[PDB]
Design a binder for these strands. Sequence first.
RNA 1: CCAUGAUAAGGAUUAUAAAUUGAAAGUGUUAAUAUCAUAAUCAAAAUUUAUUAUUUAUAUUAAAUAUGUAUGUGUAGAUAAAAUAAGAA
Lengths: 266, 49, 48, 350, 165, 63, 97, 40, 146, 54, 108, 142, 58, 157, 103
Amino acid sequence: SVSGVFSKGRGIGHEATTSILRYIPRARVPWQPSRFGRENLTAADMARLWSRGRYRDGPGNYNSGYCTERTHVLEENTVSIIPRRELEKYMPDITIGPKALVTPVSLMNARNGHRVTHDLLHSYDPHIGRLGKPAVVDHDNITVEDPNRVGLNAATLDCRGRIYRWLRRGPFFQVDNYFRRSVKLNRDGTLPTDFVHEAPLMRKIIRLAHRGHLKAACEEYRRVTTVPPVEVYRALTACCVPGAKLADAVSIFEDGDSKLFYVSRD
Amino acid sequence: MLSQNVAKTTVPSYYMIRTNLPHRKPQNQWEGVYYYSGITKRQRHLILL
Amino acid sequence: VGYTPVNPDTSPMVAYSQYHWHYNLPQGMERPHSVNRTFAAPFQSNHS
Amino acid sequence: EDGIRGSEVTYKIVLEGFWDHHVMKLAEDVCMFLKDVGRQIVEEKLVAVRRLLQGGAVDPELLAAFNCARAGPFGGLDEYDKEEVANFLRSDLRRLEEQCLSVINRCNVPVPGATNIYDPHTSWPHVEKLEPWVRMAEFWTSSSDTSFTELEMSTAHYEFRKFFRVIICKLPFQSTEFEKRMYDIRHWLHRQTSCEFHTIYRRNVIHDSAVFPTEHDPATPTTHEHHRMFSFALDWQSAPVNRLSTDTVHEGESWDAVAQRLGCSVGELKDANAERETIEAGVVINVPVTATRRLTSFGATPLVLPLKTTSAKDGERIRTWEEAAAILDCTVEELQQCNGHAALTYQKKE
Amino acid sequence: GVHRVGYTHPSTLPVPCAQRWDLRLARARIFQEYIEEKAPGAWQLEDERSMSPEFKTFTGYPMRDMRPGYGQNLPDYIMKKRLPNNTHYELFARRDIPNEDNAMYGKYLYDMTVHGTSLPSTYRMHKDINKAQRNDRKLSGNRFKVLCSSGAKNPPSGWEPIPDA
Amino acid sequence: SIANEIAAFALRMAVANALVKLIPLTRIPLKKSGLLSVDRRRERGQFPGYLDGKKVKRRFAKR
Amino acid sequence: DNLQYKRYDWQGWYQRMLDVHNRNVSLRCRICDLQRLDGNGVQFVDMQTERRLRILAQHRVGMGVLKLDADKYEDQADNVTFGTTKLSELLADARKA
Amino acid sequence: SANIPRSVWDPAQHNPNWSDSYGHDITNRRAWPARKWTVG
Amino acid sequence: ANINVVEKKKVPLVLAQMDELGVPRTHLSRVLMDEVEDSLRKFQTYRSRFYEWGRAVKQFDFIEFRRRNGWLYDLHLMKCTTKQVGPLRDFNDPDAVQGAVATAEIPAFFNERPAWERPPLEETLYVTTNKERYDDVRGGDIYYDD
Amino acid sequence: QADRRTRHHMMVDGQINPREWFNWHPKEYQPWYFDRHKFLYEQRQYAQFHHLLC
Amino acid sequence: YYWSRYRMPTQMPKFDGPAPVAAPQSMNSTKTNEFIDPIDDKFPMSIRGPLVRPDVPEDQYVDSWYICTSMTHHMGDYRPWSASAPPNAFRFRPFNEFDAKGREYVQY
Amino acid sequence: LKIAKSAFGFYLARRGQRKYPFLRRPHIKNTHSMNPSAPYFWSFMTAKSQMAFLPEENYITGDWTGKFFVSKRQVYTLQHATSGAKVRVKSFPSIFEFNSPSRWNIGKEMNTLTKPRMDLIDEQMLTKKQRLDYVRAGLLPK
Amino acid sequence: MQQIPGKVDQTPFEEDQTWLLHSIPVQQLEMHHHEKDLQDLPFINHEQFPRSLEWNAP
Amino acid sequence: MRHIGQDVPKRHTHFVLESRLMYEKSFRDCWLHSVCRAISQLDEPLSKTVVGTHQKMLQRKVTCFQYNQYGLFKTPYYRLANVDRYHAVQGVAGTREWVPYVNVSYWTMNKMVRGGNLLVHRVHYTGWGTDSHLKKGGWEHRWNKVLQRNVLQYSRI
Amino acid sequence: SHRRDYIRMGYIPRYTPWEWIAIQEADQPLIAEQIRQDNIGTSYFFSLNRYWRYKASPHGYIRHFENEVRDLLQYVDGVTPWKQAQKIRTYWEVRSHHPMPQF
RNA sequence: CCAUGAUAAGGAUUAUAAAUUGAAAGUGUUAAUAUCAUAAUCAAAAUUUAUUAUUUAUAUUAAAUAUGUAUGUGUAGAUAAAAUAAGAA
Ligand SMILES: [Mg+2]
Ligand SMILES: [Mg+2]
């Protein structure tokens, strides 16, 4: 007498809060009190639901190549899959691996706000790709499988309000959220300014500004992903002094003010 | 409790489906955009002090 | 009539009805609105 | 130019309705409004101008700005006395009064029986018509799975229309306040009517012979080849090119040896560098921006590091990377970028 | 006929002057311009239709270029090409969607602020109200279907459904 | 090419109206001879329903 | 937009759309005002400077007026910058006469 | 300047050539007798 | 509403002029800088904020702030107008049946029963609530004044 | 499984079933706060008197 | 409610009584137009004129949406041709010298 | 549609014999994809340039468990013959297989080596009426 | 027409035969315009905004 | 899902949402894709600096890269299905069963105009219209005029 | 305000009254970027190269994208082993093995 | 998958002047009857369906991939369209 879609489900948040919390009545949606969302799905069920819902390229469909079934039936005729190792013999294998799915931050405005070339859209906001936890995008680890479930899936359960949410986004959404989720003032009162991976760049900018190449230094300034230290701006404006260029000095300082946390107020 | 909280909907029924009566007010063109301009009691206090 | 409600801004049959302004009337502004001037709301961002 | 034909700042407001008479009547309203706001502003500028004309001082700064030329039209540095400069100022202000009066007078023509706002002589601002936007939608009014013929015979033509009146105001000066009232007219705009703002104003631009110098063509020419597809992204920099304003003095040099090197007068070199009374070997100096011989960043001749007798690390040959990365003041990774041979053979440069 | 294009450097002339090709190159530096080297000189064709006051279709500009083989796949076509970003395709992308007000705001938000509550779609509401009215005469034409079966199949420790006839 | 009888008709009408503006009494003979008269005739508007786009309805077959 | 797209979520991207649709900045100047005494006493733009100017910028000249349309960037600020750059650059070359 | 122009409310700036609202529209819809003369 | 507040809108223009003239804005009485800062916070905004200032969330939150301080009166979504004004009767005809061509919401102080017709101060001496009939009404008005 | 308490019912036991969301005057959904901890006469059951408070 | 707007402000006229004079009423085979006025179309054109609507400059007319007919954009009011042109304009005209084409080419 | 040959038979109307704008018909079915040309052999239904690279589908793009059929636009390569591996294409009824390798295939698409409309007609998929009609056309014997 | 100096080139043909007997192809597939491709066909005329067709950028 | 508690009368309305993502995807991938093609197919020397063997190298490298993108949206626009945001009827764009400015099907268009919902104007069914350009040259000429005011009145810099 | 016939007896203002303009105007804020004041000069070197979040972004046609192109080249060449791209074949290269490649 | 509504096609006697040769009687998708099931295009695909104007002999495949078949005395039966800037009595 009981027909369900899934056999079992799980809770969003754990014992410490729940065991006490249950004593306070929560107001459920009046028309549809019982909520079963995609955050309530189990491991298997979620895996399956994230496979389906992407037309061809998506892992769920059988000929996408990510199919783990060893046999598939086309109209009463059973077909046995060809293993990839054998598929390689007549069809050369070119795989760059993960890194070819990610463009640098530079291109992001050209790409309309994305670093990610994957099948699903990837939002840099917390709430669209949110499962139980807030979504975070690994720029190293991106796979076709998408373990973290951060991508925007077209057909999955509960996708609708998310898709709407995406189409409702502000003009700078992608860019702004990428910028604020990373790059924030330290709990100490210390600037984010010092980061290992970007340091040689800042060294190059300063060293270039000191020999008086302003344009070169700026062309490298463009490539900077993180807030540059005060020394950078000191070097750039000090380079700006001899040739009398005022406008460029002012725009430098104006770039450091209120945009970048006032690194340039010094 | 608050008397200006007053039902914006008519009782749920088939009149909603079988009639061309719209479900919301149409946007008012000359209504400004609500934006935040103002201070707290706390802030006024701070300034005066 | 349907399960999809007429959006009253686009639909002339709403707009131009007897309960709103027809296009042959003189199209001016009905009443002024000072909202932000009367009562003003202080700024609290949801983000810190 | 005089009268109607000329102005300092021109605003065009493009009003768009769904119904013609809508936008027409709208144009009349907005027009009357800008007639009154217009009269107000232009009147005020007029009383200001009249005061200015009655008398006043001259800037030290304006005076200075008249006297800056190496040589004026009579072939010597010219002395404009404050009298003359005030005379120029006065001429232009007289012109401004002419134009103010023009506008104000036009504002006062359009009385109720006599109002005609299309002709630009009769009223300020005036109004041009703009051709209406008309899109014809053509489509099947039948739902039939059965026959093409029947779908075709059922075809309706309907249209979307959009109607445009354009409002022209030419003004003798630029007031921020006029712009404010004008951008504000979008808030009391009529029902279902929107608008555009076209502003055309006059603005001083500045051409430097410093940053965009006028030079002879290169003694090597540029072929068609420098122009292929993606030659824009590869073979060219974005102008202006970077010229050094800073230069190091070589050993046996004197003021005019350096000046003859940089392509400028001795005086100039002394003034850009005014801080220094003498220039020793190995000192950094300010190139006067009018110098002819100024150098471009990174001349086309590659700096080369020979192995040779090096540091005291050997006194024989240079070995490890970061040694040279210290010699040339760069990160080791750049040096590895440039030399593809010396990277692939080994790191000890065997 | 078929000839070799030729260029006389200004140093060679018995008066120096600026050659027109030189200027062409100056221009091509300034506004960056792809010089198409394989451009046949025999193919200059004004487009008769739109460029001659004689035809009713006259725009005064070269509307199309007349090359029969021109196609979207060619690299040059891609270099002068307009990108779909911020064109009408986008405006369609965002404002054409099944329930229009879901472009204006989150539905839950609007409802929760205006009414105290979230409201069903009208269709859902039809389903429901009919459920009520017809459960109140007949019964057991029905079926119990849900998202998750584990709630009905093991019910909690209390929960003794009222027997019915 | 505007050479064809319809365009010629138009041309005639044009010249005639001019002539009347220039020599007022000349308007009486012209009018009687039906020069000044304007005929209103048009090609039928284009339309998808017809085969050729103008006058010809599509083929009909008994069921 | 004062009408529909005025006040809700879509207001942002519509507004932005319109601003990026309008990013064109037109930059004009007559060639009569380019002929003036420069600060060194030379005439800034003379006959041959204008000939070289006119051949340099082809259709970018009409009715004795130079008009540069800068569309390159999404915003009007950067297009005034880009436009002024191309203008001073074009004058730089045309002055070679 | 002032938000509402002085030319609106100040009687020293009053415009004597202006007419009242009703007068013009009353004299506008007048259709005068078209038999002014005998014979035509 | 109080009109003259528009003059404060003049300020962010004047300020800009101060920059062009080289008058430092930081020499101003602390008093006036507070006053003017408040003026700015009234009318000035940037491109940045302006792209985002119509988010539905922000609008509805403003509505909510108004709800907690109990001023819902002027808001659009949050008011429901009830009372209709009836037509005027002509002695030229009772026979004529008038009907509505157009409808607009306007404040009641345009047409409301003249001070000498109505009972004395109604705010103080009479407690009046406009409310809905609970019963089904076959004809007449579904809102009555209690 | 399902019963008169879970099922959709217009009327349970000859009277209007309160368990149905759509059986209420929608005004009831409009938000309110808890009174009880505040003074006796602020409480909403005395509402008609509120204009008279002190 | 949101529907509180759409109540009837006044009482609608009842339908008390018979068909109006010369209404379409339909016997055995009768082709019937509710739309066409019975009396005034049957009137001969030579008397009434080809006119459907008052003869006035068409800027006062707008083609209605959803109705096939035209309306006055100032409802019910009319200005005669004499108020479009200047006082005493021959064949009411901007100016008396020439027609449209004449004005234009003279100007040229 | 009359008979539902797929999912879409429920959704779609035929609308008589109806004309579409040039080279746009909703459902691409290339009946002409194999259409013998001796002189045009390299230019017909193939790469508009000989200097182009093979399509995406001639290469393994990512880590694959494996596939059932390779797409029909994958060009036949010498390795397709030599390696002696399963080469499958999705055709109807089920799948076509390149079983009997030849060098005459090389450098064409299997879009070109697979006959879309077969002359072999099963009578088991036909209604009795349909079989009658095919007999009218002088296709099926009777 | 300007051309790259030192390149071997042809001049527009005066003799009809030279046109007709050359290897110049005819348009065969669908035709493409780099700008006009975005507003798709003549029959589908895509417009983002309803600006007057006459409208003049200032 | 599985037809339980469904909100919309027509399920396939959802497809419209999906369609939108398609277009969104293109915005993200378009520029990328096109560059990757242009650099790929280009025979002439790429530039003065990049020539010969370096050029072939880079070309193949780029096409290798473009290929490695999984999910990149390469599908030409005219191959996407147009669907009604209302009743989810579909049409082939460039035919009389789809209406371009409202972006709806013939069916919906009819339904929406006849009962007044969309505001349009009737015109004589057999003509060119009220409009001048279409009256002149037909579909093609108005098309051209569109090209002209979007592009050609600007002298680019 | 004093006019008691306003919408009721049929008087609808043809010109929107001064008071109302003053109010509508008083309600919305004025954008600061609309003031248009430049006394310095154009920033030739730095301005277009400024920090990536707030950057000047190219738009429309690909030419304008010059900077980005450079990056997309560099990046790609860095991530793409020639070992892999070796395998990508040209149509003629393949066809060389068909018994009759050339006619 | 049973589960009401609603717009097509279809020439047969209100005529010439300052003037329209396309109609309501309903053609898949739309709002109250529920009680078998996920069937939806994002490419490159399988002819049986009454309801469709194709290029007919000087020159003939280059860009999204684009049709290999039917020369047979303008030839059976039976069918199609039009009195509208055209020319019919
Ligand atoms: Mg689906
Ligand atoms: Mg029916």
